[PDB]
Amino acid sequence: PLTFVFSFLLLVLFLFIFLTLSNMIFEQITEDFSGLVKAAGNRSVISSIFLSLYAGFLATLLALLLGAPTGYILARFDFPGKRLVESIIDVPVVVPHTVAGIALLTVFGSRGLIGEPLESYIQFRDALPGIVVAMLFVSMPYLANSAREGFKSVDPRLENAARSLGAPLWKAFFFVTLPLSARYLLIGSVMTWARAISEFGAVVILAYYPMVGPTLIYDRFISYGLSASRPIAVLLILVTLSIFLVIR
């Protein structure tokens, strides 16, 4: 009865997603398998991937360095602005990609809050640190919420137990809390790394040019049409599944 209808609609969604990402690979490994072989050597491509993984790995180390403690905090304390602070962290997944780029530019752009007064030390726009900051703003939430639930997982008593045995808060956090929340931090970091690798709109506006994997695919798509376009998108996914799957 109801189970059926519902199950049909579901099978739908499944195919919808599955067929789409499948189909796309099908084409490539069908009508022009060689295209891949070409992309594989094409520096433009390899440089765009290694860049993504790179920029990403970085944004993650920042996420780790900020989301982690934001989690430990959020999972143990209760202050007045927990609601607000808790929402700002949540927001970045609803700030339209473009918008985030513009907004980000307004700060790290050569004429922005932090970008203007820092022309001598580091440049942001069209540079690496520009894409790094972009990614972070979009993927950070993941490592946060994930590191919160991680710490939330490890109950207080253990920290208190260590404390009374003679361990200072950090020794507690380091020898106990942390190691026990690892499984959560690890996943969250990787989830982050992947929300980064896959960020387009946000990055384009601030630093479209060192051509990040996802941007490249768009560049090619308009210029050289869908042919030199697909082979890069297929080559990119395979890397996402490789990563995503070597760990989840």
């Binding site: 208190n160 260590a162 009374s164 045995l165 003679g166 200072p168 106990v176 026990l180």
Partner: protein
């Protein structure tokens, strides 16, 4: 060692007002009354996880009310022994050491022995049973060798099968370490059996304090009497134990009961008022126990009638109001308190 001075703290469900106590060195002090939420917090505040609103906390004579747990230099064992799951037993024991920077592996192998854990020293915390965990707990909690051992509900949550031993283990550490233990429980029977003193606290309010005997054989009005009223528990010493049948001594009388205990064992015999009878004479029944003595007081109740008899041993007897009239309510009538032996439960 432990002194609470005019303590007071306010949470969302527990209120502590003007609490003053003095647990002297080596004394096994027991707080009785509170239920979970309370117990655990009161103890946490002692251990220094909660700064009071008003008042002081003085361990070993040091004002610690505003210090930190590591500095309070105590031993703390939650009810659910909070063992660290990512460290084999040994590693746990070690922790305390590495934390205060100490060397002696003797203390560790010796502490491990004291709690009979040598054989588990290598296993991982989750494969251990209650006691196994609890021991390991007490083990690492006591490697830094403090003098003050704060424990919370260490007993009530175990298989009766371990409780007996459990109690020993503790009593033993109490002495062989010359510990000053602060024991918080809601089990009055546990309280008796192991206290040097009881501190009755109801709804976060100190109500009475004093040796066991003083708390039960002399309650304060209403609250306390209601919490422990009419129960016969006789602290005695087993004089003979031939074939499972014990003969225990209380004050000047002898009681027959049953259980595996050896002569010289300080035991406890529980006897309900509804299992004691009263005759103006002792006949030869299948009743092992039959004691002389007179009536002390007659508490006419509903259908029943409480009666306190003095047979060398204070006994609380219960009777149908009607028998109480066929006989004499006279506070002083010669009497024979006879109770069945197989209805006397004995604990150690």
């Amino acid at each position: 060692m432990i002194e609470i001075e005019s303590l007071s703290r306010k949470w969302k469900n527990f209120s502590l007002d003007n609490l003053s106590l003095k647990v002297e060195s080596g004394e096994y002090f027991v707080i009785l009354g509170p239920t979970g939420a309370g117990k655990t917090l009161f103890l946490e505040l002692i251990a220094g996880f909660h700064v009071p609103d008003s008042g002081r906390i003085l361990l070993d004579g040091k004002d610690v009310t505003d210090l930190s747990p590591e500095k309070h230099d105590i031993a703390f064992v939650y009810q659910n022994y909070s063992l660290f799951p990512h460290m084999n037993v040994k590693k746990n024991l070690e922790f305390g050491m590495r934390m205060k920077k100490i060397k002696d592996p003797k203390r560790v192998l010796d502490t491990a022995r004291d709690l009979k854990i040598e054989h588990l020293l290598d296993r991982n915390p989750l494969t251990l049973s209650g006691g196994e965990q609890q021991r390991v707990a007490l083990a690492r909690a006591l490697v830094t060798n403090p003098k003050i051992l704060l424990l919370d509900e260490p007993l009530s949550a175990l298989d009766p099968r371990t409780q007996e031993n459990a109690r020993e283990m503790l009593s033993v550490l109490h002495k062989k370490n010359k510990l000053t233990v602060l024991h918080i429980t809601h089990d009055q029977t546990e309280a008796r059996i192991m206290a040097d003193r009881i501190a009755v606290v109801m709804d976060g309010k100190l109500i009475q304090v004093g040796k066991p005997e003083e708390i039960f054989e002399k309650p304060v009005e209403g609250r306390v009497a209601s919490f422990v009223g009419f129960e016969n528990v006789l602290k005695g010493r087993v004089i003979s134990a031939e074939q499972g049948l014990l003969r225990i001594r209380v004050g000047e009388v002898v009681i027959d009961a049953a259980g595996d205990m050896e002569v010289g064992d300080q035991v406890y015999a529980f006897l309900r008022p509804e299992n004691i009878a009263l005759s103006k004479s002792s006949t030869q029944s299948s009743i092992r126990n039959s004691l002389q003595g007179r009536v002390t007081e007659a508490w006419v109740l509903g259908a029943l009638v409480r009666v306190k008899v003095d047979c060398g041993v204070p006994l609380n007897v219960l009777i149908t109001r009607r028998s109480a009239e066929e006989m004499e309510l006279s506070p002083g009538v010669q009497i024979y308190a006879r109770f069945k032996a197989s209805s006397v439960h004995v604990l150690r």
